[PDB]
Paper text:
The long-wavelength beamline I23 at Diamond Light Source overcomes these limitations and extends the accessible wavelength range to λ = 5.9 Å. In this study, we report the determination of diverse protein structures by experimental phasing techniques carried out at long wavelengths on beamline I23 at Diamond Light Source using S, Ca, K, Cl, V, I, Cd, and P as anomalous scatterers. Native-SAD uses light atoms naturally occurring in proteins or bound to proteins. We demonstrate that long-wavelength native-SAD has become a very compelling technique, where a low multiplicity dataset from a single crystal can be sufficient for successful structure determination, making it a general vehicle of choice for experimental phasing.
Calcium is used less often because its K-edge is located at a longer wavelength (λ = 3.07 Å), typically not accessible at standard MX beamlines. A domain of the accessory Sec-dependent serine-rich glycoprotein adhesin from Streptococcus oralis (Fap1) was solved by Ca-SAD on beamline I23 from two calcium ions and 1080° of data to a resolution of 2 Å. Compared to sulfur, the calcium anomalous signal is stronger and more efficient for phasing.
Numbering used by the authors: 125 to 376
The structure:
């Protein structure tokens, strides 16, 4: 008889999260999705569930869709395709049993917020993936292979604004002006080469990236050299600040 536990083989993620082992590092106001793949030596998994603790690890049972709120009307969902359970060959290396995760986190959810959930799969004999350890109690995500975490990060951690090299910042005054206006910050700012394109909208309706001059910035510049600070505010309200040089010369 089968006395071998099903085995979590692989996790994949897409969109607004980064995977570190069993932890999903999620940037606010961005959709993400994930898959977790399991195999069993029998080739068949009978039950699969997501639960908030490890207490019911050993009890074979199935969940459909479970979720939790993440502020700003947003949520994370954990989904089992239950109609694929309890079929021969549904959990082989070439056809792993796959559960999905999808959602997003609202801007009002604090940075470093952390949720723990547990995913269990069961073969027909009732052997289960993972174990009964409470990773909160032992302060160690890795102590239970069934544990997964969702950790909230600021969009400012993901993005790196840079200066658009093609836009002129060396100005010459006209014949009869003491100043020249630098105008809008947005014309000078882009994403650093090889880093993610800056967001436009968030998930919360009405959220969007802004490009402004830092409070206290004078924008009508007289002759000389200047350094101005531009503020990129992401949809989640976190910010990068980038210093931008300008030169103002008199007309000959
Ligand atoms: Ca088995
Ligand atoms: Ca940044």
């Amino acid at each position: 008889r089968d006395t071998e536990k099903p085995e979590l083989q692989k996790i994949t993620v897409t969109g607004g999260a980064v995977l570190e082992g069993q932890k999903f590092k999620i940037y606010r106001e961005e959709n993400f999705s994930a898959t977790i793949e399991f195999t069993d030596n029998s080739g068949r998994i009978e039950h699969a569930k997501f639960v908030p603790t490890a207490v019911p690890a050993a009890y074979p049972a199935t969940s459909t869709v479970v979720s939790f709120t993440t502020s700003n009307g947003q949520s994370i969902s954990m989904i089992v395709p239950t109609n694929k359970l309890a079929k021969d060959g549904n959990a082989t290396a070439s056809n792993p049993f796959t559960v999905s995760i999808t959602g997003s986190v609202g801007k009002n959810q604090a940075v470093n917020s952390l949720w723990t959930r547990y995913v269990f799969t069961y073969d027909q004999e009732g052997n289960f993936s993972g174990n009964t350890t409470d990773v909160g109690l032992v302060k160690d995500l890795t102590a239970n292979p069934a544990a997964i975490q969702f950790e909230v990060h600021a969009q400012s951690e993901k993005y790196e604004p840079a200066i658009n090299a093609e836009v002129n910042r060396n100005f010459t005054l006209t014949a009869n002006s003491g100043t020249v206006s630098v105008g809008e910050a947005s014309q000078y700012i882009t994403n650093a080469t090889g880093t993610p394109e800056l967001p436009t909208t968030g998930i919360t309706k009405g959220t969007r990236t802004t490009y402004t001059w830092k409070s206290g910035t004078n924008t009508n510049l007289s002759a000389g050299r200047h350094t101005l600070t531009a503020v990129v505010t992401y949809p989640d309200g976190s910010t990068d600040e980038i210093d931008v040089s300008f030169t103002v010369r008199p007309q000959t």
